[PDB]
Amino acid sequence: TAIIRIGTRGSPLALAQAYETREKLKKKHPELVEDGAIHIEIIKTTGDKILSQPLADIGGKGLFTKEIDEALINGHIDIAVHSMKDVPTYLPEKTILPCNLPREDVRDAFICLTAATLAELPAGSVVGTASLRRKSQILHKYPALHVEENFRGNVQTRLSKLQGGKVQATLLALAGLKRLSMTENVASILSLDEMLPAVAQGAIGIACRTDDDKMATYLASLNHEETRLAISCERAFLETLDGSCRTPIAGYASKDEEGNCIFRGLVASPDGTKVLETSRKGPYVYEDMVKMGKDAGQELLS
Numbered sequence: 001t002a003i004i005r006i007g008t009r010g011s012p013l014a015l016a017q018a019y020e021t022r023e024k025l026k027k028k029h030p031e032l033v034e035d036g037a038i039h040i041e042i043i044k045t046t047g048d049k050i051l052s053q054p055l056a057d058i059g060g061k062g063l064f065t066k067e068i069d070e071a072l073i074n075g076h077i078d079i080a081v082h083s084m085k086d087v088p089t090y091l092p093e094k095t096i097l098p099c100n101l102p103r104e105d106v107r108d109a110f111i112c113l114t115a116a117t118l119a120e121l122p123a124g125s126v127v128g129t130a131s132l133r134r135k136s137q138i139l140h141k142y143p144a145l146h147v148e149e150n151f152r153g154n155v156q157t158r159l160s161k162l163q164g165g166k167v168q169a170t171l172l173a174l175a176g177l178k179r180l181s182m183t184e185n186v187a188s189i190l191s192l193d194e195m196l197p198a199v200a201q202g203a204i205g206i207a208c209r210t211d212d213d214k215m216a217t218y219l220a221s222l223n224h225e226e227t228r229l230a231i232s233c234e235r236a237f238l239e240t241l242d243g244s245c246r247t248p249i250a251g252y253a254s255k256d257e258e259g260n261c262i263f264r265g266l267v268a269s270p271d272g273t274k275v276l277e278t279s280r281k282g283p284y285v286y287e288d289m290v291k292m293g294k295d296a297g298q299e300l301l302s
């Protein structure tokens with residue numbers, strides 16, 4: 001019998017995230033060091049199945065989370081580890097998400113065998129990405145490139161497609177390559193001025209049941225409030241815009257050297273021809289940050 005059953009997707013990256021969580025828990029609570037104390041429960045989700053078409057062409061909520069949320073709500077697992085960018089803006093009834101691990105680098109990596117940067121790609125070169133956020137920002141700056149949207153799969157599947165010449169280049173979160181120790185695949189890193197990240201990129205979230213005080217106490221030892229606050233700001237922005245992984249929206253909150261919250265958000269047309277950016281600054285305090293993301297979102301709306 002385990003003290004903690006951790007639910008996760010079964011890709012190498014999702015297991016990397018679950019093992020980071022295990023390592024951090026063991027350091028604060030040494031009873032979890034024993035093999036037996038922690039059980040990792042690999043759960044298949046619908047997003048693991050529907051891989052043959054672009055993400056913006058797949059309906060429904062919670063493609064990468066629903067089966068894990070159901071395992072948590074019903075007591076099959078005790079905590080659930082997610083990539084925060086894949087968590088719906090509405091949390092499942094009966095669960096809370098009180099913990100984010102320290103955020104990784106939020107920037108996108110450019111992955112290419114022949115060119116160092118987007119600008120070095122020949123006209124007509126094909127960039128694979130199923131993200132409208134990434135497609136819109138690429139085509140805004142590089143209208144002569146072609147984006148292949150039917151570009152899907154786990155990190156290593158996308159790297160395999162690139163090696164097999166299915167596209168000329170792709171983009172991946174630098175966070176995931178770091179967590180997989182596969183950063184030698186990076187050709188260059190895109191700056192925040194070239195590519196604003198998906199809401200909550202680089203953050204791992206951990207959920208538990210609302211009524212589970214034991215788990216909430218373990219998670220309180222892992223939570224990094226500076227990260228959780230930034231993600232709550234970006235998610236307020238996303239929620240206002242009714243955004244998801246299928247919408248061309250980006251947003252990034254962080255704490256500056258004076259201790260304020262600096263937020264930058266954008267919405268773009270999928271063809272890249274129009275982009276609206278907003279930026280806000282304010283205290284690094286939950287209610288102010290959530291209101292800031294909401295206000296920013298309302299101003300991208302009106």
Ligand SMILES: *Cc1[nH]c(/C=C2\NC(=O)C(CCC(=O)O)=C2CC(=O)O)c(CCC(=O)O)c1CC(=O)O
Binds near residue numbers: 198
């Ligand atoms: C929010 C968002 N999510 C995706 C795609 C994925 N989410 C995942 O959990 C995974 C699996 C990663 C793994 O190795 O475990 C994927 C990849 C998949 O095709 O299923 C995306 C699209 C990213 C893209 O195609 O560039 C987004 C949108 C975004 O803007 O990040």
